[PDB]
Ligand binder design. Structure first.
Ligand code: NPW
Ligand code: NPW
Ligand code: NPW
Ligand code: NPW
Ligand code: AMP
Ligand code: AMP
Ligand code: AMP
Ligand code: AMP
Ligand code: MG
Ligand code: MG
Ligand code: MG
Ligand code: MG
Lengths: 277, 277, 277, 277
């Protein structure tokens, strides 16, 4: 009804970054991922793989001691801030990060909110997902805050019931991005990407292969990595959401949509991203 | 002798579900898998991979603390109910599940039977396999109970000796499905799928590549996932057994039947299932 | 000089077993693998993968508690006898196995020899490798004993110096197979397979891709599995040694011989074995 | 400005070693890798995979107890010296190694320098990387010492600021290789390989796919393995640096340069190395 435009293949091709010959890992920054807990460890691996696949320089994973060993053999390229998401509840970060994500596989607790409050004093884009999403307001800061709710999480954030939300997705997402002054990636078929300056887009990619545990955890990681290699954080968010869906569409060419596992999205991204270069 | 019909490719094609564009993981439900023990941990990974490959929305694995870390790196998409199969012995489940499986890699003990008794008070289909199979009766409930014995397990359940059973497989399977009022998937070459309402089918797929440890553990998982995406639980059971065998037949096109490992069935299923769409 | 014949492709094709449609895992037996220690854990994974790829029904791995978790995610199809190689030092095995292997990654100790002495009271073929190879004699028993030394291990077994051995490999291997009344698989380019009844063969397959840690550990496993699916244990040994080498020759078609990792031999075997069917 | 020649495909083809039919693992030696720590475990897996892929006979990894289990499932072919990098601080090595590398994922501490001092009393090539790089001098010894700094590490070693270094890379690398009497592999686009006898080369391979955490850890391992199979250690260093870059160039043919993970370099090397045979 609002005629929200799609972020199309043409926009993706025009905005994906180069990886220059005269670059090193520092050029692409160090990201921090605060994710994973004892009974939801896998979300950290999923988001970590999404992040490292998505063009960052380095990744530090701040997770519980028991989660670390479960990541290493699959994603040996990441390093660790031991019990980092718990530690983040106690103090401002002393390390400089290019971008930070918090929430996948974290319990939805006040301690996690304390960690969010500390991370927001950093000068970098911050993504809040999953257990880091709550009903709250956000401090004025320079770097964007990017919230990635599915409709259930949006209800938790706003009190807008899911059945009402789903009738007017872009309208609600835009209204709340404006009110909160955050980016809102309202997930679902035709994901809405609403910016607090009023810009808004729909994502045209993806299918029901994505309707399975873990896929949003992977997405959070993809956004985190893309924030590190794109000059414009808006493009990073839009390209992450687009390519995430494009990976599922590649899968379904020769595989049943019932059968995708989220980590395979990260495995598919290398070839999919090349197509748009 | 009874002229039991085969569940054929035509029946599979006619009954496999769509994965709608306007779905999310909740559409396809959360399954519970109660499996894996200290000296048989791998059965939990095998059944978990089968389940998550088979069209569910989410999977919770209730297994021993020592088993959890062995699953995560391979199947990061699952979450955990820590010591869940032991905990299930103590109380009705407070969580709602779309379908539940219990038994792979569980010791054949009275505590496991206590867990079975608690899970059966849930209102969902329940699969009993392996260490959860015993000589017993089943309470009247709305959701189907699906037993998945091989002939040795059927002897344990019924007292019918294996050598006698194997001469009259469909007759025994039908008789006992009726007596117990459970589904019985009596495994073997030409697996019998006997329903307590008298319907019965033979499975036409599979080969001796399946004659190796773990393959029945994978099957239990495949049934669990298919119960979550099929409207008719009968079709879910029949399609799981069929596709499980079809995966082994794909394998043997270019690989020796002596050399299959059960987890590869789950890896093959994506492409095999696409063929029937 | 003795004109020892090669075990050729024709002999392999004539002797590889069928996997019948009317078989189950029990048809192909349960093997026991006694392997792996705290600072050499990987040998257990290598031999376990070789075994399960090679046509057995089930595999029990008797290894240290700390080794178990390192196997499971890669070879979830195996089950465990916790601290089994240590436990085997204390008593005859109460379980019936189709075939047993002992030694890969085990320290070369008197306790391991105690375990060997207990395993030899079983009525099945037994393979001794690596840390289970010592200077000793063997009791009269029905099942074959198969020793798998490289030339260094043969020196340890016999006192024949390596430089002397390597000039007259088949002569020494035959002499000592006769004296000990064991099979001896004397490894190296042109591996010698010497039977205690005087039969002897050379293996024509393999290349320097195999000249790297772990490949003999994989071989022990391959022999173990092949003993479970071949009616004639002689053929099992000969086909294992042949196919092990054939896997390296496949690898080198498109990969450098400097770059093979032993576990990949197990990954290649499915396609290689199909070629000989 | 100095007209430093490139180490070209022709030089690689002329100097890569054969893997003879009449070789065994001992022919290619046992390497020691001292790498990996609790919050940087993955560097040990990365360097270990690079090493074992690169033509050694055996690899011993001296790492922390907590790191060992994270390597085994992915690189089962390696064995361990438990807490070896810490133990190396206390005494000369009693074991003979073909080549030794120290530093990836090790904290940059005086204890690591103590380990370096002990390893240098061995008679073999030694590679120092990462946490083993410090401002120091080196004792006269027969085997080469190979330092592998990126420009930040070179600043730490020398006091030459990065912005100055990067204007005159070959000049500085040559000057300091001469002063220290070590090989210096000064990383970056157009890596400089400077020998203490005055020979110097530029590497023509690689791209921004390498500008991500872990890739230098992999390289250290590749050098370690190549030192074991090349007769001339100069060629080993030059071929490792060249092939490492060539692997990234293969990747980018069909994958985006933003998306490479370092361990995949090791996975690509088998096919890339074959191209130069
Ligand atoms: N492997 C791991 O470690 C995994 C970890 N994970 C972690 O689990 C944590 C909890 O996150 P979660 O999303 O699983 O559960 P939760 O917040 O209760 O939301 C469900 C509610 O939202 C609703 N709803 C959602 N989408 C909707 C739509 N399109 N349209 C309509 N309704 C929609 C849904 O509605 P329903 O289907 O019930 O109608 C239900 O009410 C979090 O930390 C996450 O990172 C998971 O990613 C799993 C894999
Ligand atoms: N990796 C893991 O964690 C693994 C875990 N697993 C777990 O192990 C547990 C025990 O289950 P299991 O099936 O291994 O042994 P068990 O119940 O003793 O049955 C064998 C008996 O049945 C018979 N029999 C079977 N089929 C037959 C047929 N077609 N036709 C005829 N006879 C037939 C067979 O006969 P036989 O060959 O002796 O004549 C023998 O008497 C269970 O929890 C399972 O999940 C396993 O899946 C292994 C991988
Ligand atoms: N990942 C793991 O867990 C791994 C574990 N492993 C475990 O390590 C344990 C020790 O076994 P191992 O074979 O590594 O050492 P060891 O018995 O000292 O033998 C070397 C001696 O033999 C000689 N020699 C050998 N072949 C020869 C030939 N063709 N021709 C001539 N000489 C020959 C060689 O001679 P050299 O080269 O010194 O002249 C040297 O003297 C064992 O339990 C094994 O399973 C390994 O498999 C590694 C991967
Ligand atoms: N998965 C794991 O276990 C991993 C483990 N690892 C381990 O981490 C440890 C620390 O090593 P590290 O290289 O990450 O950090 P560090 O020494 O602080 O160097 C950065 C400094 O150097 C500079 N700089 C570098 N290149 C440059 C260039 N071309 N041109 C210009 N400047 C350049 C850079 O400059 P900047 O970008 O800031 O301008 C910054 O100042 C080590 O043990 C390693 O093995 C890592 O490999 C990660 C994966
Ligand atoms: N049917 C669908 N079509 C397109 N995208 C979907 C579909 N189902 C799920 N997704 C995407 O999958 C992810 C689910 O996130 P979450 O529930 O946090 O795991 C989001 O990126 C969704 O937009
Ligand atoms: N020879 C065979 N032909 C067809 N299916 C088989 C064969 N051997 C085993 N299977 C199947 O493999 C599984 C074995 O289950 P289980 O013994 O519980 O692991 C069941 O699905 C069997 O029907
Ligand atoms: N150059 C080679 N040619 C053929 N086979 C080889 C070669 N080097 C090693 N092997 C085989 O690799 C294995 C090495 O065993 P081991 O030393 O116990 O790991 C044996 O099967 C050897 O016969
Ligand atoms: N843009 C680039 N072009 C070529 N090689 C690169 C590039 N960025 C990084 N590398 C290589 O990647 C490795 C980085 O090492 P390090 O920082 O120790 O992980 C070295 O081998 C670098 O020369
Ligand atoms: Mg989510
Ligand atoms: Mg079973
Ligand atoms: Mg050996
Ligand atoms: Mg480095």
């Amino acid at each position: 009804a609002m005629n929200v435009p799609f972020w199309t293949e043409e926009h993706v091709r025009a905005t994906l970054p180069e990886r220059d010959a005269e670059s090193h890992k520092g050029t692409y920054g160090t990201a921090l991922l605060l994710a994973g807990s004892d009974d939801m460890p896998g979300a950290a691996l999923l988001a970590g793989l999404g992040a490292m696949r998505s063009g960052l320089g380095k990744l530090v994973i701040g997770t519980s001691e028991n989660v670390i060993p479960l990541i290493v053999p699959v994603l040996p390229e990441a390093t660790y801030w031991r019990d980092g998401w718990k530690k983040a509840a106690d103090a401002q970060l002393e390390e400089t990060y290019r971008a930070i994500a918090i929430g996948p596989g974290l319990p939805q607790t006040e301690s996690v909110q304390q960690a969010v409050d500390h991370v927001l004093t950093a000068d970098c884009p911050v993504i809040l997902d999953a257990g880091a999403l709550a009903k709250r307001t956000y401090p004025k800061r320079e770097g964007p805050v990017i919230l990635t709710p599915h409709p259930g999480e949006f209800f938790r954030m706003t009190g807008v019931p899911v059945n009402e939300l789903q009738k007017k997705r872009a309208e609600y997402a835009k209204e709340w991005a404006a009110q909160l002054q955050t980016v809102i990636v309202l997930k679902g078929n035709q994901t809405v990407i609403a910016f607090p300056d009023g810009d808004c887009w729909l994502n045209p990619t993806g299918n029901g292969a994505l309707a399975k545990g873990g896929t949003g955890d992977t997405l959070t990681g993809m956004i985190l990595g893309m924030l590190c290699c794109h000059e414009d954080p808006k493009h990073a968010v839009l390209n992450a959401v687009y390519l995430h869906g494009a990976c599922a569409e590649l899968w379904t060419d020769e595989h049943s949509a019932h059968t995708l596992l989220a980590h395979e999205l990260s495995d598919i991204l290398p070839r999919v991203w090349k197509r748009f270069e």
